[PDB]
Amino acid sequence: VLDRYIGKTIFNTIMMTLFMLVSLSGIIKFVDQLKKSGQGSYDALGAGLYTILSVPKDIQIFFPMAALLGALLGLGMLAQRSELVVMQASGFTRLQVALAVMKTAIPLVLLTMAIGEWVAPQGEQMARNYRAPGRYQLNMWSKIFQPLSVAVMMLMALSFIFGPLRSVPMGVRVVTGISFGFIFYVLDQIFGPLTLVYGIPPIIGALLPSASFFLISLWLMMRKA
């Protein structure tokens, strides 16, 4: 049961965080549609464009950036109420918490890959139709590595909640999630297009620095043991 409670806490925080951040993404880009309004209709952009405007922003961008911010705010919200320490002081294994949260990423990658194969390219391509290689290859392989990125953002939260938690204020964790969750962002749109500039072969590198958060999550897991 204690793992199921971890699931709702960690999974509900990830889902709610994704929803609030998606609302922000919508209206911040919605006002962008208001800027492009006058082609024929803005209220239609409010209804028809908005729904298929929201779903894509999660998978390529706001899902993993909010995935870290979901557990690192959530799994640290338990340690904010001293739930985690009592969870560990009751003998729930530290390697079982990572076996608990990451096991709740299996229901979360399915809610990402299936929302990134059947409605992210089907809806977004439908969303721009409502407004009437060097590039693709890098992206496509990266979009296959999308489940690994949220599984690593969720693995970065475990190290950030078992390593640098240091009885911090929840606020600090949020900006840690805001910052590394933004570091993961810049490392996904700068390093990813830079791949062709430095000639990093897709067969070997491409978006791996984005998934090299693992190596940034592996020096943050054994550092103090």
Partner: protein, 235 residues
């Protein structure tokens, strides 16, 4: 059953916040870790529990080393730690909360595990809170769920981190009564509360630590005979 420490010492970044402190607690022997705050009282306590990793000392239960062992591995054997904060499993009911922890004890079968859950629920008079969400409970109620939860892991020694933190002195009887049941069973208490005037009335013997090194070890009656606290603590 013992929870002994050998020459414990630790520096956060080189300040030597604790220097050669040894604490020994036997089952049924309530012990208090009293003294100046931030001077080593909490850090030595947190080093025993496992929150602060061990540096140069050594903690032993009976003969098994638990120095490198983290909290949970130490906890899975005999250690039950009660945090200062709430830790009431806000989004989980008390029935589930106890049964969630009880699942850690692997040797206990599910059919008997439910009886163990009912045993603790009626042991701390929180059985009627099985349907309660657990989000909000009174200071009397809140600690009883935590203690039941900690007692559910069936530890050998339980360490209370300021059980008398921000509590009205009429509930100090309730909190001490919760401590009284822990000593009534084959359990070892370790209180770390700063209210020395309220903790010391419960402990058989206490280790009082100051400026890094423990200076007083024994019953509070013996502490009053110690000149350090009678001249530099009281006057």
């Amino acid at each position: 059953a013992t929870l002994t420490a050998k020459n414990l010492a630790k520096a956060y970044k080189g300040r030597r916040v604790v220097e050669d402190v040894s604490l020994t607690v036997n089952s049924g022997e309530i012990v208090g870790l009293l003294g100046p705050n931030g001077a080593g009282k909490t850090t030595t306590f947190y080093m025993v529990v496992g929150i602060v990793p061990r540096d140069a000392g050594n903690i032993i239960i009976d003969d098994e080393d638990i120095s490198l062992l983290p909290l949970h591995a130490r906890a899975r054997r005999g250690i039950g730690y009660l945090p200062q904060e709430a830790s009431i499993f806000r989004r989980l009911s008390v029935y589930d909360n106890l049964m969630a922890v009880l699942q850690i004890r692997d040797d206990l079968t599910s059919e008997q595990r439910e009886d163990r859950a009912k045993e603790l629920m009626e042991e701390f008079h929180i059985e009627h809170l099985r349907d309660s969400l657990g989000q909000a409970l009174s200071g009397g109620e809140r600690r009883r769920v935590e203690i039941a939860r900690a007692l559910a892991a069936n530890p050998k020694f339980i360490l209370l981190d300021e059980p008398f933190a921000g509590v009205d002195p009429i509930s100090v009887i309730d909190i001490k009564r919760i401590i009284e049941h822990l000593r009534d069973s084959g359990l070892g208490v370790l209180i770390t509360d700063h209210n020395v005037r309220e903790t010391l009335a419960v402990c058989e013997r206490a280790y009082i630590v100051s400026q890094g090194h423990l200076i007083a070890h024994g019953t509070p009656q013996q502490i009053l005979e110690d000149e350090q606290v009678k001249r530099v603590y009281l006057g």
